[PDB]
Amino acid sequence: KQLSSNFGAISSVLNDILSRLDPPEAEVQIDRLITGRLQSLQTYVTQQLI
Amino acid sequence: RVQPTESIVRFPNITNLCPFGEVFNATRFASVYAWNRKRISNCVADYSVLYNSASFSTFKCYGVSPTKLNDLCFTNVYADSFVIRGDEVRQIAPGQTGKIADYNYKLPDDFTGCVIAWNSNNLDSKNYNYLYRKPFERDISTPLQSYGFQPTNGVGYQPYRVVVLSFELLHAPATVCGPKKSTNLVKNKCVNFNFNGLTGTGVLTESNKKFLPFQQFGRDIADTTDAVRDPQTLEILDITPCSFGGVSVITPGTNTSNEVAVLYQD
Amino acid sequence: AYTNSFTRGVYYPDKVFRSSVLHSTQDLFLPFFSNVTWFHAIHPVLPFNDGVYFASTEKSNIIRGWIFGTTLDSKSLLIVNNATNVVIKVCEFQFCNDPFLGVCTFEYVSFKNLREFVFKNIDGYFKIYSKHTPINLVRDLPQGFSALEPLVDLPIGINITRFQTLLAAYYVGYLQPRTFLLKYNENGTITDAVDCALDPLSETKCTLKSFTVEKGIYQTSNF
């Protein structure tokens, strides 16, 4: 379900951002998505180890 | 990862050239308080004609890119046609306020579209026909101040014709497509499919899913497209992802041999 | 008079297929068991507010359409279902004081029956959800659930605060921005719904994301 979170992006779909935007803005939106999914994954891995 | 064997560009069987000649070469434009909204539907719309035209004073796409405009198919396209003062060009943007921005024409913050404007000093100025004072509020109740457009005035006082190309995003069967050549639909292969901008990679199989007729594409728990409907053949096709697994090299050590065995994962 | 709205007023929030998933969504919905107003036409201009639930148990389809808008007379939407064609115009038609049927930016040309409609406008886009089902009841709205589906969306750009139903009783409700947990079946149709702010049982059901809540104490919201 945390895949579906936008984290401030225009969509949670990566391909929509890649197909809609030029890379000077699409890299920023993708950067927000990597930040959100990486934080969610690190939280998950922390729960996994505990 | 199983690599994609081919690619599929799929667009519906529409061949209609899209009427931008009545929009951008119009003999009359609306006022900013009584702005002309024209619905655009069911056409092959080439926006690179508008993007490569050097007669336009500005070109500001926000939600998409003008290079990607022909790559996407839109559901509903509306051209907000109004004649405004060139000093209020910068008011046509999300999250602003002004005489035209907060009274005459309010534009939404989450706006997905492009705004095109150009000078009309040699067309509209001679004139006081164009007047001024929630998103898209066309209040025409009369309290209304007119524009003093003359051709001998300054650049900030020249009349400028502004077209706001708003695009409704794809949550539905779309109708306003770009100039994309449709391809043949290969089944049971990892393909780089494209259903009106719904790009992706997977195995296209036949499905027994029963869509509602107002629905373009299904979705999954992970907000991913589980199924699509082909826009040229009314059938429901699942998208199974390409078969993927990790690579695990069994080695007895380089102290014994260099012969390895490759275990693929699941 | 008044009738019980029961479980009705739930439509499809989007044009996206889902199946076998308990999807929770938020949109303008008619709340569960709300106090909808009974109108009868044997032996009226009503407000619009924010979204209108409609329902009409028609024995012979006397009710054929509605007039929407703010002033509703030559200054407005209009649906006319004459013979077997639903003729719709958005013209500023000269309507009557009590507009009735005998025995221009848009133009469209196409108790035993329950015809339910949901009328709302989102930034001028007049989204209409509709569903017709056969019934056998002469008294009121029957206790049952059936989803409504979007068929007509019109970017009218028209402010609407009043509406009037023209003609087989009818019932008028109002949509509210309430969170709704919907249950899609194996076939992808809405079969069951939960309002997330009706009562603390349904608040517990919305919190746990399940239509079955077992024994225990469950923190739901903040008083």
**What DSSP line would sit under C94-136, residue for residue?**
---SS--------EE----EEEEEEEEEETTEEEEEEEEEE--
How many alpha carbons lie under 13 Å from residue C160 in its C-beta half-sphere?
Answer: 29
Q: Is C122 touching B (CB cutoff 8 A)?
A: no
DSSP state of C40: -
Q: Is B223 touching A (CB cutoff 8 A)?
A: yes
Nearest residue, CB atoms, C124 vs list B136, B171, B210: B136
How many alpha carbons lie under 13 Å from residue C25 in its C-beta half-sphere?
Answer: 18
One-letter amino acid of A4: S
What count of CB pairs under 8 Å joins A to B? 35
CB B150 within 8 A of CB B46: no
Nearest CA in chain B to A5: B223
- Interchain CB distance below 8 Å, B221 and C21: yes
Nearest residue, CB atoms, C149 vs list B214, B216, B227: B214
Q: Which residues contact C165 (CB under 8 A, 6 or more apart)?
A: C39, C44, C46, C54, C56, C63, C66, C172
**Phi, psi (rounded to 5 degrees) for C206:** -75, -30
Q: What is the spatial distance between Cα C223 and Cα C201, in angstroms, rounded to a whole number?
A: 16
Q: What is the spatial distance between Cα B93 and Cα B107, in angstroms, rounded to a whole number?
A: 7
Name which of B143, B139, B135 is nearest B112 in CA terms.
B135
Q: Which residues contact C85 (CB under 8 A, 6 or more apart)?
A: C109, C110
Name which of C37, C33, C38, C41 is nearest C6 in CA terms.
C33
Q: What is the spatial distance between Cα C8 and Cα C192, in angstroms, rounded to a whole number?
A: 10
Q: Where does chain B show beta strands of DSSP type E?
A: 6-7, 36-40, 43-44, 58-61, 77-85, 113-119, 131-132, 145-146, 159-167, 176-177, 190-195, 198-206, 227-229, 236-240, 247-250, 261-264
Name which of C49, C73, C78 is nearest C176 in CA terms.
C49
User: Which chain A positions have a beta carbon within 8 Å of B7's beta carbon?
Assistant: none
Nearest residue, CB atoms, A21 vs list B65, B198, B223: B65
CB B190 within 8 A of CB B5: yes
DSSP state of A21: S
Q: What is the spatial distance between Cα B244 and Cα B264, in angstroms, rounded to a whole number?
A: 9
Q: How far is B66 from chain A (nearest CA, A)?
A: 8
CB atoms within 10 A of CB B70: 18
Q: What is the spatial distance between Cα C197 and Cα C33, in angstroms, rounded to a whole number?
A: 12
Which candidate in A20, A27, A33 is best for mutational testing of the B interface (most B CBs within 10 A)? A20
User: Which chain B positions have a beta carbon within 8 Å of C21's beta carbon?
Assistant: 221
Burial (CB count within 10 angstroms: exposed 0-12, middle 13-18, buried 19+), residue A8:
exposed
- Interchain CB distance below 8 Å, A19 and B71: yes
Q: What is the spatial distance between Cα C159 and Cα C137, in angstroms, rounded to a whole number?
A: 36
CB atoms within 10 A of CB B15: 6
Nearest CA in chain B to C129: B214
CB B149 within 8 A of CB B112: no
B107: left (phi over 0), alpha (psi -120 to 50) or beta: beta
User: Which chain C positions have a beta carbon within 8 Å of B216's beta carbon?
Assistant: 15
Q: How far is B47 from chain A (nearest CA, A)?
A: 14
Mark out chain B residues that contact chain C at CB-CB < 8 A.
37, 39, 76, 78, 108, 134-136, 138, 171-173, 209-212, 214-219, 221, 227
Lookup: tokens for B11: 């667009």
HEC string of B86-121 equals HHHCCCCCCCCCCCHHHHHCCCCCCCCEEEEEEECC
How many alpha carbons lie under 13 Å from residue A3 in its C-beta half-sphere?
Answer: 9
Q: How far is A50 from chain B (nearest CA, A)?
A: 25
- Residues closing a segment before a gap in chain B (C–N exceeding 2.5 Å): 126, 133, 142
Stated in angstroms to one decimal place, the resolution of this structure is 4.1
**Phi, psi (rounded to 5 degrees) for B203:** -100, 120
Q: Where does chain C show beta strands of DSSP type E?
A: 2-4, 22-29, 35-39, 45-47, 52-58, 65-69, 78-82, 85-89, 107-108, 113-122, 125-134, 149-155, 162-166, 170-174, 176-184, 190-195
Q: Is C19 touching B (CB cutoff 8 A)?
A: yes
**Count of helices and strands (H, E) across chain B:** 2, 16
Q: What is the spatial distance between Cα B194 and Cα B7, in angstroms, rounded to a whole number?
A: 8
- Where do runs of H (alpha helix) occur along A1-50? 14-20, 23-49
Q: What is the three-class DSSP state of B85? A: strand
Q: What is the spatial distance between Cα C1 and Cα B244, in angstroms, rounded to a whole number?
A: 63
Widest pairwise Cα distance in chain C: 62
Burial (CB count within 10 angstroms: exposed 0-12, middle 13-18, buried 19+), residue B124:
buried
Q: Is A24 touching B (CB cutoff 8 A)?
A: no
Lookup: tokens for B219: 């979705």
Q: Which residues contact C114 (CB under 8 A, 6 or more apart)?
A: C55, C56, C57, C58, C132, C133, C134, C135, C141, C142
- Interchain CB distance below 8 Å, B221 and A10: no
Burial (CB count within 10 angstroms: exposed 0-12, middle 13-18, buried 19+), residue C76:
buried
Q: Is A1 touching B (CB cutoff 8 A)?
A: yes
Residue count of chain C: 223
Q: Which residues contact B54 (CB under 8 A, 6 or more apart)?
A: none
- Decide the pairing of beta strands B6-7 and B190-195: parallel
Question: Which CA distances in Å does C2 have to B257, C34, C36, C169, C215?
Answer: 87, 10, 6, 12, 37
User: Which chain C positions have a beta carbon within 8 Å of B138's beta carbon?
Assistant: 157
Q: What is the three-class DSSP state of C171? A: strand
CB atoms within 10 A of CB B161: 23
Q: What is the spatial distance between Cα C163 and Cα C71, in angstroms, rounded to a whole number?
A: 9
- Interchain CB distance below 8 Å, A18 and B199: yes
Question: Which CA distances in Å does A31 have to A16, B48, B200, C215?
Answer: 14, 28, 20, 43
- Interchain CB distance below 8 Å, A3 and B200: no
Rg value, chain B, Cα: 26
